[PDB]
Amino acid sequence: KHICAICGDRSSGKHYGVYSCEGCKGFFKRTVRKDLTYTCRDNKDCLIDKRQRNRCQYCRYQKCLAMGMKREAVQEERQRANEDMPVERILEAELAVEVTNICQAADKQLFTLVEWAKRIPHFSELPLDDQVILLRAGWNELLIASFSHRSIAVKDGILLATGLHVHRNSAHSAGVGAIFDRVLTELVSKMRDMQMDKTELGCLRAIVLFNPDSKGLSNPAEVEALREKVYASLEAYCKHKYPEQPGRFAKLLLRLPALRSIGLKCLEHLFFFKLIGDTPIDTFLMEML
């Protein structure tokens, strides 16, 4: 009938919003379903003819997009108690393991974080590579989320996991007061004004731990699951020990954004502090950075 606006072959219909030959139609369809990511070995400048279109997939698919081939057009292949994450192991785990002055406590608490992580259900049960990745991706966020809870009863300053009350002032001058303020008000306060028990903080740290996005996770589907498990678990928990407050589960999960905003800022700092060499940073902190 028409000519496939992709290679020149005979169209014989409109497919995915474009006059296309059967071949191209099927190329596109599969690319979309099997979620494939092609790569051009040449200059992304490959011609696509009735012949030599099968030459390079990347250029061919992009030729589809250009010629307006719609992806959402491809339909979807026609086929086919509540304590898997016990709140106890968590709590029990969040228990048994407890500027230049902060990097000492940081590093120290790093060795002990591998311990905490080991105790969190199913963690050590999934591949060692992911155990690395998961801890690489979120050590700073984890660590901050814990000392921040510790500095809960403490006033306008934090208590390093070694015993060093770092009162605000000390920091605003130490150069890093910009962030030290946010850590107090967006984490400490919020947690204190909410009386976040340490079973909850453990579940939050777990949620941070089981991060399915963390680049490289052999099987991320696995991770996105243990996380949903902690979701289910903690939700119920707040339901049992906190009936008066329905919107608690929500307000707890909403303590996480800031944890990451802040977390990112910190890492930003430890860098223009690292390959500078003006202050001491131990070993474990070097592998993490």
């Binding site: 060692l128 690395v132 801890l135 690489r136 474990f284 592998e287």
Partner: peptide, 9 residues
């Protein structure tokens, strides 16, 4: 190396 050590055992 390190993290992989505390995990390797």
């Amino acid at each position: 190396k390190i993290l992989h050590r505390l995990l390797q055992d």
